[PDB]
């Protein structure tokens, strides 16, 4: 049951193993807090494996977050969906720039600084822009779920859904 | 023209000078970045005046933010509306607890962790809860502007309007 | 003819000699370029009189500009209406903040960074805010002449008329 | 997703790679401030690449600005839309001369010194004139969006829209 599931997930990772242009360490999600909102997880790679603080973490469908602390053989990763996390993004098709902030909900981000009149709609893909010099650019982050316009305010309300699996992830990739 | 305006504002501060239960230093807003979104300001009090990092800052109508760096005679204050700022709050009437995050818009906060079914509505007052042990409790923070409910997601979307003046403030109070 | 005119203007200056809260040097406008758009003038005070680069210059009705270069007994002053000049201001009544830029026209300024929905109207007085730490705050700068709203853009177009006389000024005051 | 987008943008640059008459360095936009009004950006070329202070910067559709400071491998570029920036221009068809100033809005310039009666209309193309000896002449700058005439004042109000992408740009060209 674990050997099947692990194989399926591993294959998916091999199919998306060409999405990177560098060396990536295949680490597994191991320590997780029981509460289903704890937007921070642990990985089965650490210092011995060359993992460092700040390192980006992704899966076969999206950027997941960043390492925020390292142990000899394990490490802690803050997910994009944490209220404390922000990532610069852009709408894939047109290059419209924004900041995606965590909401504390496992399945939602919110985009900041999107003009109320901006060309953005449900289903548009957001990808990393790299503009904070933390993440490689071009990797999928989320898809727009909703736009809410607001009378008198400069910026629209934009809710999005991460493309990575967050809570339902198995194995994770660390970028060098 | 400055003597009139300054007097009006000062009076308002004297009328709300009984809202505190301790000693408060009356400081003025002095250095501000030209850009009208820079959610961070400076004050005309500093180290010489006993101002410290972390100190809460408010006006006659709301909590404004916190000191984040000190100079001999001036200081820098991060406002609640900054994307990096979060404050624990509660709905005044019923005690429903939430986290108010800055949106980067001068006139808006967003509440996190509010159950989709929660008893919250447009016009409800949010006040500090003190639960992060950073702010005194009971001081006005914002009023709910909008609730948006979301199918399948645990938490509602709540937008609120700070009660303090943020960008349109003159003088500020520092709590000891 | 010059003794009458000079007396009238001097009196007006004596009536507005209580608008300052410090020592002010009464200097006259002396060297001016023939072209009626040259938004830069000279004054009959200089180094010998303690005039310095950066010093604010005003008349009985408004801030006029700043000294930009000093000579033994004369000095050059850049006016607010020069395209290269900007001054932080605020709407007197409500404290709405903005940047007033010179237009190159002797009788016009333009305000930057005023929300399209902002509470501003024809006849509102703008005064210095001091927020650039160059000018004393509270001194009259201009009155709003026109608001033009713009579909899709965040900021309104605001044209204003300086309260100082610019080209039709006689004598000028330098603030210490 | 980044490889597609980057290819499209690169092609567009190859199609407009004949607009220059000299050697141009293809640099990418890398460091950008989160705030969506910060009219200043960074490029992934610098001193090592022969980039210098003052150097003009453009894209496939317009002049973008100028380098204002150089680092070993990166550089900072001030955009035309910054309130501090001015560029001499001319109406393409008739040669009517003007100064285009930044407004602080990402999508707007304003023309100075345009006679109220001047032959200028919505949709006219403005191009660099070279007359400040900073920019090559003939390169597209903006298109007129609006003319507002003003009773008693010599100069019309002219708002224009840059042809370059400013905030929505990917890669940039530096002119030698």
Residue numbers in the entry:
A (entry chain C), B (entry chain D), C (entry chain B), D (entry chain A): 79 to 254
From the manuscript:
The elongasome, or Rod system, is a protein complex that controls cell wall formation in rod-shaped bacteria. MreC is essential for shape maintenance in rod-shaped bacteria, and mreC knockout mutants are not viable.
Negative staining images of MreCPa lacking the TM region and the first 21 residues of its N-terminal helix (MreCPa(36-330)) revealed organized bundles that associated into tube-like structures, some measuring several hundred nanometers. 2D class averages showed an ordered internal structure, allowing the determination of the helical parameters. Subsequent three-dimensional (3D) helical reconstruction of the MreCPa tubular assemblies showed that they are made of six sets of filaments consisting of two protofilaments organized in antiparallel fashion (green and cyan in Fig. 1e, f, 2a), with the core being formed by direct interactions between the ‘butterfly’ domains of laterally associated MreC subunits. Fitting the refined crystallographic model of MreCPa(97-258) into the cryo-EM map confirmed that within each protofilament, monomers are ordered in a polar, head-to-tail fashion, with the β-sandwich folds contributing with complementing charged regions towards formation of the interface between two protofilaments. MreCPa-Region2 was unable to self-associate into any kind of protofilament or higher order oligomer as indicated both by the lack of fibrous structures in EM and the low s values in SV-AUC (3.3 s, fitted f/f0 = 1.6).
